[model samples]
Target: YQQFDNIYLGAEASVVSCFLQDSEGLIWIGSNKGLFSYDGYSTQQHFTYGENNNTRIYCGVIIDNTYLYMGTDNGILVYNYRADRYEQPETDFPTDVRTMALQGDTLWLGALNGLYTYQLQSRKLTSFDTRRNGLPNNTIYSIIRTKDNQIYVGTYNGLCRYIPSNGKFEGIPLPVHSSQSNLFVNSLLEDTTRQCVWIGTEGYLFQYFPSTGQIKQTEAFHNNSIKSLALDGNGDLLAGTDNGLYVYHNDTTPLQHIIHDSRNIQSLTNNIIWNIFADQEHNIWLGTDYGISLSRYNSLQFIPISQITGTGDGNQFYSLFRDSKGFYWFGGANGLIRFTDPAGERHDAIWYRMGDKTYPLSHNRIRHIYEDKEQQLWIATDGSINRYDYATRQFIHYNIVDNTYNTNWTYYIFEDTAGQLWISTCLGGIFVVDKHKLMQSTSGQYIAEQNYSVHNGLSGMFINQIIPDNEGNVWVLLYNNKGIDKINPRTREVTKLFADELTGEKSPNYLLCDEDGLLWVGFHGGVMRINPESQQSISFGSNEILSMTCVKNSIWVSTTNGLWIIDRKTMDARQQTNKRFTSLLFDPKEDCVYLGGADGFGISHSATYQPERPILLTALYINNQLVSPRTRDDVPNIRYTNSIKLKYDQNNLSFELSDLPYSLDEKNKFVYRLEGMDKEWNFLKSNINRITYSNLSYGNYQLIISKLERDGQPSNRPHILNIRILPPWLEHHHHHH
Candidate 1:
């Protein structure tokens, strides 16, 4: 029941040497050739060395906020991982440094020749070798220091225990190994419950008790050879071996082995396991020969609906729902699909295709689906509307063409607390239908209540979504980012508000009503929470939210940047993913959420987030010429670019800015100002990269760069640069004469 991404790491040769997680929870993959980072969702290679691409790193450590010290072949390298830039000095090793162990202010490095210890506070480096201290071998592989202040180094020949007080090594050879056949240890893991250490070697994984010198190779076993080892959140041993990944449970549960199987995509992608790591959230990362795999024991994997049901009709879903009985339904362009949680709790599913001999529906384009309090299912589509008949097992069809005299596309269908149904159409307008009354339509003689369209108070004829507020009023969003039509449920009066004004210039897409009756508007420039009572708008973020739903007190929003869970009160976002989600359904009873897009649908038990990265200046230009980041003599480098001196001819200047976590669809927002030009800061949105100022007067001006918040206020600390335009480089000749 595991899901494998196989190539989630985005490696070139797939030879990952090691892995590290930074302070921001970004996974840094140490490959044999270069360095790459993954934020659990996307791959970012911002620090692959330009010309020196043949860098090899085995292990690394992030020392607070200073540097990420990595033991590479070149030397012990240090990097400003925040900026993805390399910096500083290293010991002249000339030999390969294989492993590193950081203990407080002291750093221990195991190299090919021997071991080196450097103290941060003392700035003193001490080296030890076999000739100097009875060491077993020079080729070191792994280093681990336990809570009891015991240091152990795994090497090609054997294991060595280093006691700083004794200042020597205690070698321990394998119990069943010849002198020629070296152990060649690769990884080490310490068991906190049992006073033992788990050592992974070229052949097997063994539990070694230091107190008794007992080697328990049979207690922990893996097929072929062991490359890496880790302890999951459950304290089970996760061993990566040549055959696959093996999870050795501490109790009676048999060890589970997973390998690449072409028959099942959820299986491991490769057999040759290289590394295993567990992050802060207990997500296990497995590195194999061809690709990397991630596993979480608690939640369901995001397997697409098409793959689970083995049909293409489940894909391209526009509407999704999970009924009270724990059955899920997906409505898409091709047809409609009904399924269970694919976790195999129940085995019933249905794929209703268009133009089928049975299961009649007016059209295949299913836009929205809703089940009312009476347990009656209603569907809205392009051709006609439908109601699912429980007794007949067929759809009860209703044609808008016959009622309105003209037919068009329909988008959303919703039920208010008063049991009335509100439906929105594309070319037509809002249609408020009394459901119980419509069930007896032949006797009631009422089709739709007035057909609220452009002839009424609605600003536009086309409507996209209809949501009812707590004040017993129905709100309908105009199709093309026009405005919202507020209809009083009792009086049937329409009040059109300019709701699109807060959404900027983007087209309106999705809308949701929270618990307290606040209307959450969705568009390209992020979410806007408009109080239906006061009619005031409060903004959330800068991402293009495609779909949204209310879960608990927060709203789960799927946007262009990622999936976010925004709190109802603070509007502070908790990012769930960087993947696209067009539709979503959260079933509180099932405690699971269904994710849907035009391509696939997935289900997960829980959700997760990260804050947005701050923006910075990427490039600067003087008279259309690029300015270098490095300082030359007295000139500024734009890093600390101070008061820039400019001649009359060089008055035209430009600047380009960007943020660290770069996504293809997401754009950063900014507000800039030049003191001399205007006192007010000009608002800017997605097109905020380049800022230009042409033809300036001779004076001193301060150029301010500020990050615009979800609201219009400034969120980030602004960067300021003082610039002075000189009077003239050449004086008038008439003054000299």
Candidate 2:
């Protein structure tokens, strides 16, 4: 018993008529408008018309060498799979070709007049109309060739078996339900195994026995009409009618009613079965007038692929932080997980998570988790924020602003001591949420104002990260340009800090404030400690610093190269050198330093500064050597060049050197002229232990290389090679040449 899983309903819109699979498993289906190709998951719609109209397709057949010939209301079309493109045959036909059959690329198309044959190689067409070829009828419907090389064509009047080589056809007897009406084979599905042809007429299913040359009337099921037929992977024939779907298992068995719906299926109704196909998985997909329907017998179900891991006995922790109450929370891309540690216990800690519906905290992708003064757990998601009450287990959802029109996805969220929640969005700009009105607004919260680059003194508008300072000031980090900005919550004013001003440090990606009220900025170059009180910036490390934390009197910076710790006393006006380190976290209780990097986390007791470990040399190639100056056409060549040495050690080591100009993009030429060099020392690799000038040209120039190393491990550095092109070449040539 087959189940009728209704994919669509209404019109004759289902598998109306289709071509069976060829030797290579390719099925072609033709409808009133165009043709369709079915891959496994979906059907790709394809059509051909004079560029200005949709071509009306009727039937199709597969030829040798994977070529397909299609019959349409306008003309005939041919497709070649080898070239990965399709082309309609540019040939002249008697009438609009409606059906087609192929014998080794020697194609035949059924037309309203009679028949037409096409030679594939020469691209020529010849007519075989009634007077010249003695066809059974003018209106042709189906065509097939037998093993004996006899071609059988079903037309309106009757059937004709023709010997193509002799150009002669014999009229065959066709069974009729009534004396006045003969069985008109409007469509045909040939079953080679049973040596029978399934005939689809106005409203009946008939079987033509080719072995005995006898046409027998089968049972008529649907009173409407026969539209299409398909055999399942198991070889059971299925028929589509104007009423619903049907299946015929065998010659002796009763017609199996597969589609048993009471809907009036039109010829092109969404239920109008247009085409049917079975994929490699044995799942059948049917295209009808409306859309598509699929049936899967396999157990493999569709599931979304994601990196989120469920909570269990063993899951790698992505984020960890300790709350004021000594409760440790492990946040992942999935949800907010909590772990409670009991004093004097060796057993596992108690784990708990929030669960609810309205503001359900499921799969929020907790990015930043924090605790307010009231001990309320604040969870920030990629969408909104949720407050979970531990004692009550009650969850309350806060809409930053109803995600409606301005659903700028949230990036990070944090609360300051003043109880104000600071929210950072992908493009919505920095937002300060009033704690009292968070649970009220349907959207989210009252966004103070849209602070962006144009309105405010920011570099570019897109904000990526944000953090609150000790004085209620929010540090906004921009991903594309605006550099770093400090917004005062009380005054609602913004202070812009350019990336160049924080030179020698990393490309600011994260910002944080420590217990000492100092703001720390994390950049690709490393970490920079900003003295908000004095507006002083210091560069630390040589690798990109992703995050930073302060414990007691020490600062912990996380960089791609590793981590490091800088004591307040040691940073008291002391410079940095080359050194390698990872992440740094000072355990106040143990007075020990914890560092993490590519190798993981560890404790180091060494306070000795090797600032030369992860020393990086970032060479911005300008005129030839490493430089950071801009260029254009006015200055076709650079002049006056020098190399500046910048290092990253405990803090980001930075020094500005001037006296060089950049070139311009004029004639696609970048020539630099330099003069005067310490020609003696052979200049040891510029930013190396010192400087060099192997490729020095003839003018005055200055070069600078910003060293960004992680834990002091020096890699290829950013060398700012400066070159100065002597005056104008034409002027020098006029005087010399």
Candidate 3:
């Protein structure tokens, strides 16, 4: 199934009447106004010619090998698959055809006037009306052939069995209400494994036992009328009703009822389902009055996290931290919330706000949360630094004894290898606190607090973030883009790097230390990689970088536009998602990555995550003219050569790329490089379907486009196209002279 953007309602009609998957795996939909063929990308309307023409189609569609049979309001229309055209077969029968079924060489057609059979080899047409063949009713709604080759016909009055040898129909009496004399059969289904036939009427569903000749009515389907029916992957019956979709496991047990939910956008979009189809991939597609909806049939499941108590109006989550005690704590703009058991099945898991009257915290606006080596939970907020005490259920706020340092707004807190807690503030420069000395205080007196600022040889006064390397040295990200400062806590020495290259204007928003001990800093312009030992740094320009985190060998960076996952070894970057993230965390226990955004938090498994599959160059265009691969003139020697020669004026070009076996879940990132013109690869998001180059200079160049994987790995092979831009006639003559 495709995304909502893939649904094409641009057809001549809005209501789809029937759907059929041909032998070639093509989807054909018969709508109330026209017929259309879907190829997973776009919809093509097949022009029909008749009395009603493409105005209305209620008869439904069926396929016989290469020939497609579509029931219309003006008889049957046959489409030749080889010729790609439609033909009206001459026949003297009812104009309104309802349903059709195939029996080997014979085609059984149920029409509004009678039941007709057409011989495949002989092309013979025969009809049987209600008056001539003793049928209960003239209008036939549904038809199905059982495993025993017995034809079951659902008519307007009741169920009937058609004997092919004698050309006769035996009407079977169905149980109905006392007010109604007979039930109007709407649909029929035959389960070969159970040897039972399920029938749908106007108000009830019945299961027929051919062996016992007993018809039992299922009470679960008493209120709704079933318009369409099919079996899911588990052999459960799926009934499409006027209200919604229903699933039934056995004759007596009801499985589930899926209806439209006003609160949940992911719920079924429409309730009036006209047709239901189960594809080979086990995905159930529902063609409703509004549009089509697909329910994925897979083991992977997604649960949305939203509307948690005390999460504030925007539900803006800043960070997700799973503590060592199996509790999950979420920091947000409003405050901090703790969950006792996050992995519980029920929503009854205990939750509480940290900064309430009962549990006094240092601040209500939490910026970041972390757990140090001492198994202590530390929270940095807009007010001050706070540490949670589980035994007393209270927060311990660090109150500086000296008035020289401002500890009102702590931005970041880092614990170094020497067990020294370093706190960075928004108003002040930095504060060094000795945790062991503070714990060993006798009379709750003043502990050691050393403050450093611009007076102490730092680049700037405000610090945004801090990261410590393996050597116990702390690296500080000076606010207001003052670049970075390396501080030796042992000697009280400060050395500034990148101060000349980067102006002291935009400070780095995030900082991380990878497994290789490289300091990764992210800011608005891009990301910077620095080797602390050598004091050397390199910058990779990108979008507005917001947050950065490392898990194993890969570094995940969140930006204003999207998310990028970069491999530390190859320096290859892949844009993973387009969703803007405020904070990111890598949970090693589940091998999952949790992303917090403005809306809510989302968890994605990192182990099973693979880069998007390679995309195929489906079509190429020059000057708005599509270059067809089928025609040799358009793409000569297309197999080995993707070369193209263009005139100087014909420089406008576009290439369309698509993933094979199209899926909505696939997120792709593209990077293209023009060998002669571009020195570096240019990155693009998934929304840019076509790569267009216009007004190019006359030169011989090679265009190489690569698809990146989740872990920043490229596909084994990339698409290459050699291009030659010829000079104009006037320029060519001058160059020749």
| All candidates: TM-score | 0.45, 0.36, 0.48
| Best of the two (2, 3) by TM-score | 3
What is the C-alpha lDDT profile of model 3 across 1-737, one tens digit per residue? 22222254564467777777765456677777667766455555665444344655665545556566777777777765434555556655456887888888888888887788888778788888877787888888999898888899998888899876778898777875775676688888897766789887766767898899888876445667788887877778777888888788875674588887667557776777777778755567777776666675542222234434433344467767889986778777756666643333333323334446665565667877878888888888876777888888667776544344576788778777767778888767888778667555554434446877888778777787777878878888776665678888889898887766555434566677887889887766556677884443334454577677887788888777777777776667776535677877788875777777774666666533322344555555678765433222333322234676666776787776544333345447778878888898778786665677777888788878887655576555678888888787633422110
Question: TM-score: which candidate is best?
Answer: 3
TM-score of 3: 0.48
Least accurate 10 contiguous residues by lDDT in model 3: 630-639
Q: Pick the winner on lDDT between candidates 2 and 3.
A: 3
**Candidate achieving the largest lDDT:** 1
C-alpha RMSD (angstroms) for model 1: 21.3
**Model 1: per-residue Cα lDDT over 351-452, one tens digit each:** 666677777667888888888888888888886677877677677776553264333477888777766667778776777677777776665234675477
For candidate 1, what is the lDDT?
0.70
**Model 3 misplacement above 4 A:** 1-8, 22-26, 39-44, 47-53, 59-67, 80-84, 87-94, 220-223, 251-255, 262-264, 300-664, 668-684, 687-737
Task: Evaluate residue 527 in candidate 3 and report its C-alpha lDDT on the 0 to 100 scale.
Answer: 63
